[PDB]
């Protein structure tokens, strides 16, 4: 099959390029051009393109390891309960656990996660997308969502679109 959220969760930081292609299905994937030495894999049609994952690597070597995972429309929130009021309660400095307790444990998906010092966790960055009850969409644009981003597991900022 094409790239999917299941495949995205099965691919882990530290995997080689071949491990990634084996899980994703290499016919779904590409490198070079706009994506550099990353590996970019396509799922079902969505928006003006396709659901996708992008996997970044420590180097261009064949033994390079995944240090970055990004996706769009592969993951869906299990129980989206974000609201503008809850978004307002999210504060810079909160831990990931404090944010999740605030916006709802099932409201978020991982947008991007990057380890600039892999295999160390120093400076790790995490972008979450979080969704209100009807904000997630797998094929159109979101209709109620927030972007919450962290460095070293501490919220650095937040932004929302169409929350009520």
């Amino acid at each position: 099959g094409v790239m999917t959220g299941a495949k995205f969760t099965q691919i882990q930081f530290g995997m080689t390029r071949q491990q990634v292609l084996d899980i994703a299905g290499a016919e779904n994937c590409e490198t070079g051009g706009s994506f550099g030495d990353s590996i970019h894999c396509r799922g079902h049609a969505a928006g003006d393109y396709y659901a996708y994952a992008t996997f970044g690597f420590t180097s261009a070597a064949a033994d390079a390891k995944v240090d970055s995972k990004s996706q769009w429309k592969l993951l869906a929130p299990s129980a989206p309960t974000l609201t503008l009021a809850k978004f307002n309660q999210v504060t810079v400095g909160m831990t990931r656990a404090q944010v999740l307790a605030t916006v709802g444990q099932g409201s978020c998906t991982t947008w991007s996660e990057y380890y600039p010092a892999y295999p160390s966790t120093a400076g790790v960055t995490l972008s979450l997308s979080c969704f209100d009850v009807d904000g997630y969409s797998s094929t159109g644009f979101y209709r109620g969502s927030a972007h919450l981003w962290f460095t070293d597991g501490v919220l650095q900022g937040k932004r929302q679109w169409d929350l009520v």
Partner: protein, 263 residues
């Protein structure tokens, strides 16, 4: 060709939604075929060709450099950023942002470029100044895709978009270098595979830009032709359909099949 008009009307009844269509001869500007050419449709990402035309006009006039590096941050990111989300550390040049906006439909790329030219209102002023008094961009990504019925924000008409694309690609508005660069970005389109490109014969030229939006909105603008050179502009828009993305793609691709068959 009347068989293509038959196909457009059939796409209308199969999607349950308005379809706008125009074929323009590229060199003369002559309207060869059309349907609802003066009705308004959401541009969706097709505006990004006009955006980068404005960027290139600034380059022509020495106000911008394609090599200028723009550093942006997480707060700048909006939904659907396949290229820009991978360059938070190093930034991207203006050239790289137009490439991402046109060839990958990158939404953060387009917003960063909108910021460099002063926003949707300034793009609209640019269009106004080249004689397009119809096309209007009012909002940023992603809100510009909302496609509210009877809402004229972020809309064009097929005839206006076609004529404006012609002026950008063949008129004297842009320098020769910028004319070539804009066409090159459109020829390098990576995301419009299932649309006109799926009906295109070997040896043909196409430079295009697609768009998708809310309420079944879908569209494409293209310069295409046989003998490896563009000789017509085609503009196709639809909005309002409840059909799947695959079905909307197929209807546009079939209009393209009819367009090419009866060239």
């Amino acid at each position: 060709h009347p068989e293509t008009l038959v196909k457009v009307k059939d796409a209308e009844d199969q999607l349950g939604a308005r379809v706008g269509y125009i074929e323009l001869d590229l060199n003369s500007g002559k309207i060869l075929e059309s349907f609802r050419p003066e009705e308004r449709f959401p541009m969706m990402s097709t505006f990004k060709v006009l955006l980068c035309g404005a960027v290139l006009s600034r380059v022509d006039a020495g106000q911008e450099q394609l090599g200028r590096r723009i550093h942006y941050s997480q707060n700048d990111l909006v939904e659907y950023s396949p290229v820009t989300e991978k360059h938070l550390t190093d930034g991207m040049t203006v050239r790289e942002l137009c490439s991402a906006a046109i060839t990958m439909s990158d939404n953060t790329a387009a917003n960063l470029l909108l910021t460099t030219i002063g926003g949707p209102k300034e793009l609209t002023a640019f269009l106004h100044n080249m004689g397009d008094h119809v096309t209007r961009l009012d909002r940023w990504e992603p809100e510009l895709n909302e496609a509210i019925p009877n809402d004229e924000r972020d809309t064009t008409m097929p005839a206006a978009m076609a004529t404006t694309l012609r002026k950008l690609l063949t008129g004297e508005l842009l320098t020769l270098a910028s004319r070539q660069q804009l066409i090159d970005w459109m020829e390098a389109d990576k995301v419009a595979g299932p649309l006109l490109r799926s009906a295109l014969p070997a040896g043909w030229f196409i430079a295009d830009k697609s768009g998708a939006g809310e309420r079944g909105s879908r569209g494409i603008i293209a310069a295409l032709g046989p003998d490896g050179k563009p000789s017509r502009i085609v503009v196709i828009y639809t909005t309002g359909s409840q059909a799947t993305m695959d079905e909307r793609n197929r209807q546009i691709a079939e209009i393209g099949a009819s367009l090419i068959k009866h060239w």
